[PDB]
Design a protein around this nucleic acid. Structure first.
Lengths: 105, 246, 90, 73, 137
RNA sequence: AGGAUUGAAAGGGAAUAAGAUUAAUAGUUCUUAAUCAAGAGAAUGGUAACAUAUCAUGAACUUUAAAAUGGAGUGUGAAAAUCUACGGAAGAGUUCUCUUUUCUUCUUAACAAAAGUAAAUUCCACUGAAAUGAAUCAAUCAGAGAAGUGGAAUUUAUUGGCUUUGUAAGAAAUUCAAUGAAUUGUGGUAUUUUUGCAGUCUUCAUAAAAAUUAAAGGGAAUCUUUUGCUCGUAC
RNA sequence: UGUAAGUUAGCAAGAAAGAGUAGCUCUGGUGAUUAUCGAAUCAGAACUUUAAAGGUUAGGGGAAUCCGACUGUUUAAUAAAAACAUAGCAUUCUGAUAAAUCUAAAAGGUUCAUUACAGAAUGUGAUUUCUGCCCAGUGCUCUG
RNA sequence: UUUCACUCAUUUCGUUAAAUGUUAA
């Protein structure tokens, strides 16, 4: 069993000081600095995690392809497909009701 | 002698409020024209737990009536409100639970909470969990109404003070018996440093006026005048009665 | 499993029989499920003191500290309803 | 380092002017044509000697070619 | 029938969520490959912008241009409305048949532009108004 | 347009790894291989969930999300370590008493690719459950729709989790010879650690903010190359 | 295997008490894929001996009385307790421009991002049971 | 001589000092 050491000058097991021990040539084990776990986007109404958008750090979406950070739909990337269907029905049905309620009832 | 712990509390060094995870200030929106001559519609986005208080807080979202954008408020939840509900505030609001109305448009015998003691001051009375105030009478002569405070006292207010219809949520909070010293320790997580209270008689003569001698006792009457100087004002102040009641 | 100490058997024998009997009523009602006033499913569980969430129905309701609706908060909803009707008509 | 998959990608790669150095490695089974470009080190694994020879015909004459074998340079 | 040719529907899901489209051919049973109740619609992908009396004549033509789309949609993903257009006035939408929707390939751009052109022409005369107003959710 | 200064070498944060090297510095030097920032040279497809090496325009203004959030306990995916099965190669130990024997090595980075192929959760389409079914260690779920079939998405220590591949055998390890030669298979219904995931429990406790980033609503307007400063770095 | 009185019915309880345990050679049970492959675990039987947890690690038990209910804290350096705390019970004042209270003063400061299910000031100390009589004196209060 | 009525110093507050008061409409 090969025992390793911290490479950087951090000495405490904080969230940002996560390490992974991998093997290298000759039976030597080195230290890799592993990333933190992020959260994905959430629907602004129901707070459910959206599909089609990866769970990566906020600055990493700048490196993402322009089509890999949003879904091709009205309110894509901010609202679930169910969050949007009810939006359309609300917009249409209420406007229809306001046409028979007022405007020569 | 020394300074008693009551004196040290007024300095506010370790007795400051532990308000770091608190949500904000729970109050009505500022009074304007649309709250005085019309109604505004608010949407209850969420109901949340504010540390250090027993009642939940509602995140209500009004549209800005004068500019383009939103206006995020933080109300005290009336018992019954749910997410996605619509509430209306203004002089013309309906008498439903959760709606904010001037205290003069509410009928006699109605129940309101988060009442304003002075118009536009965004809520003073009846804010704790399960508490409420009842409207007693109106006086159209000088536009004043009477309400009964949760302590049984009767107070007269201007008829245009706002109030939320209903009962503050979280009722019955104090009916559950605390059982462990640990549970009482956790009660003051978002409050002041006051919990483990040492009896004055167990102290020494320097620390407290009760600090006794060879037998733990007070030695002098524990009912004091209101005009006692700080430091010796310990016990019961201006007490008109004592003992057990029958 | 137990004769007459239902849920407060976790407290063992160290808080007084009466204090364990009193808390038993609250602790049963605090963890119990309630009928959801919108979807009518027994799927409402307490989140925090005074907050109740309908699990399979996507709603949050403000209620009592340990019960979804209190007695005091139940007669108020009817009292306001009666006054609202009277105010509208004459 | 990037790996090209078919011949026509590396024929096109050579006839462009962006080449910088070519290293040929001979192994027990295959031959790798690691063309060093400005950014990446593209390589092609070929399993036929005749196909390997064709690649050496297409290599320009102003570019340096390094042959590597069982002994490091 | 609720869904009949000429009926104006509102799409509820997909890339065209919230657009207004005109029903062309209904088939509630579905084909062998189309294993669902489907209807073919022609709709306004991009609503015309409001024009004023200040821009040049070229801009008012470009601003009033309408971009359309043709798509086979599921009957469960649309909301039929109370409005019906005259399919004879919109003659280019009658000829859009199911056999014209070839799967996996781009729809003929020439046909889309023909309907897009007529949609702009019909709108310019003001004959149809509710069809061409963008739905603001 | 909105609120000044400071406040963390354990909180948040753009981007580097392997091998070698010095009497002593090394994610800093050398070789090789990358990454980031700042520059310079008005679209399609899918029924749908959603998908397309930049692609495929998007101003003011507003909103949403990320950074960014307790603990316990149970089950499980994966990697490493230990143990072990099959198959060998090379070297060493014991050998007067036996031992086809005991022992050592049989390795691989950042960043990317996509032959083959997993576990779990959430959604989509068809159809409509009662003779109620489905499912877990426990639960838990269903006409505001179960199970079945066919799909989509995300997570799994970098691209996309594992094997594999480029890197890359030319390195390194183990031997042999006097610089030059040899090999570097495949498994496991075992244990531990680490790392995620899934639901359950618990609170009169509900368990940070900003810098910074992306998306939406809206319709205003008409590959190559250069640079990357200051300070800490010995023990 | 067996286990008392007492009890807040949860415990007391590992109560107390009794029997077995080694080595060697075997047998059976608990799965996966369609005979092979694997898991340490449980039970059983003969035989032998120096009759077997004990190299190391590893609870003395019972019957009562007093105090504190319990988990917790305490005189750094002679006192760790029957002392403090505690939950429970109770008393007092306060409608917030208030109560308590820091400051020489202050559009000053703390509880207070608060609002009587709250804030502030005290006594007793879980549960059960009960809190007797006295308002003359000293306090405190009064709508006199 | 307290007893009142107004506001004009003064006290206590609220906002982005964001429709107060009187007519018209």
């Amino acid at each position: 069993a090969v025992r390793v050491t911290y490479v950087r000058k951090h000495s405490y097991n904080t969230k940002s000081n996560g390490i992974r021990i991998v093997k290298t040539a000759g039976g030597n084990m080195t230290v890799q600095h592993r990333q933190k776990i992020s959260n994905g986007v959430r629907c602004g109404d129901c707070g459910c995690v959206l599909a089609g958008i990866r769970h990566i750090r906020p600055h990493q979406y700048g490196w993402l392809g322009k089509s890999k950070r949003t879904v091709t739909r009205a309110y894509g990337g901010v609202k679930c497909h169910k969050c949007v269907q009810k939006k359309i029905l609300r917009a249409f049905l209420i406007n229809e009701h306001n046409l028979i309620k007022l405007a020569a009832a | 002698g020394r300074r008693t712990l009551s004196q040290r509390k007024g300095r506010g060094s370790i007795f400051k409020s532990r308000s770091h995870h608190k949500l904000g200030v729970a109050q009505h929106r500022a009074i304007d024209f649309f709250e005085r001559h019309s109604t505004v519609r608010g949407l209850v986005k969420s109901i949340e737990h504010d540390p250090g208080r027993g009642a939940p807080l509602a995140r209500v979202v009004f549209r800005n009536p004068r500019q383009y954008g939103l206006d995020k408020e933080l109300f005290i939840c009336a018992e019954g409100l749910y997410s996605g509900q619509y509430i209306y505030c203004g002089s013309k609001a309906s008498l439903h639970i959760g709606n904010v109305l001037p205290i003069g448009q509410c009928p006699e015998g109605t129940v309101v909470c988060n009442v304003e003691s002075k118009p536009g001051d965004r809520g003073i009375i009846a804010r704790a969990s399960g508490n409420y105030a009842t409207v007693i009478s109106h006086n159209a002569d000088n536009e004043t109404t009477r309400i009964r405070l949760p302590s049984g006292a009767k107070k007269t207010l201007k008829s245009n003070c706002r109030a939320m219809v209903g009962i503050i949520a979280g009722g019955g909070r104090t009916e559950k018996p605390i059982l462990k010293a640990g549970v009482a320790y956790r009660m003051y997580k978002a409050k002041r440093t006051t919990w483990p209270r040492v009896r004055g008689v167990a102290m020494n003569p320097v620390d407290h006026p009760h600090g006794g001698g060879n037998h733990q006792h007070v030695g002098h009457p524990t009912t004091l005048k209101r005009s006692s100087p700080p430091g010796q004002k310990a016990g019961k102040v201006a007490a008109r009665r004592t003992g057990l009641i029958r | 499993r137990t004769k007459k100490v239902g849920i407060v058997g976790k407290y063992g024998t160290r808080y007084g029989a009466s204090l364990r009997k009193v808390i038993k009523k609250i602790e049963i009602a605090q963890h119990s499920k309630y009928v959801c006033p919108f979807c009518c499913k027994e799927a409402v569980r307490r989140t925090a003191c005074g907050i109740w969430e309908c699990k399979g129905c996507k709603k949050q309701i403000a209620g009592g500290a340990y019960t979804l609706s209190t007695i005091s908060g139940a007669t108020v909803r009817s009292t306001v309803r009666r006054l609202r009707d009277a105010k509208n008509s004459q | 380092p990037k790996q090209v998959q078919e011949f026509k990608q590396i024929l096109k790669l050579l006839k462009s002017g962006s080449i910088r150095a070519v290293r040929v490695k001979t192994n027990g089974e295959n031959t790798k044509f690691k063309v060093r470009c400005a950014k990446y080190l593209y390589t092609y694994i070929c399993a036929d000697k005749a196909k390997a020879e064709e690649l050496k015909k297409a290599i320009p004459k102003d570019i340096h070619v390094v042959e590597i074998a069982k002994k490091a340079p | 029938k609720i869904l009949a040719p000429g009926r104006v529907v509102i799409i509820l899901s997909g890339r065209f969520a919230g657009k207004k489209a005109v029903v062309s051919s209904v088939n509630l049973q579905g084909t062998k490959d189309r294993k669902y109740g489907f209807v073919t619609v022609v709709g306004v992908e991009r609503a015309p912008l409001k024009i004023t009396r200040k821009m040049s004549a070229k801009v008012q033509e470009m601003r009033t241009s309408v971009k359309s789309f043709c798509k086979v949609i599921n009957v469960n993903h649309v909301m039929p409305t109370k409005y019906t257009v005259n399919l004879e006035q919109f003659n280019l939408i009658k000829q859009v048949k199911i056999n014209n929707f070839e799967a996996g390939k781009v729809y003929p751009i020439s046909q889309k532009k023909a309907i897009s052109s007529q949609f702009a022409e019909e709108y310019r005369k003001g004959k149809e108004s509710w069809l061409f107003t963008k739905l603001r959710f």
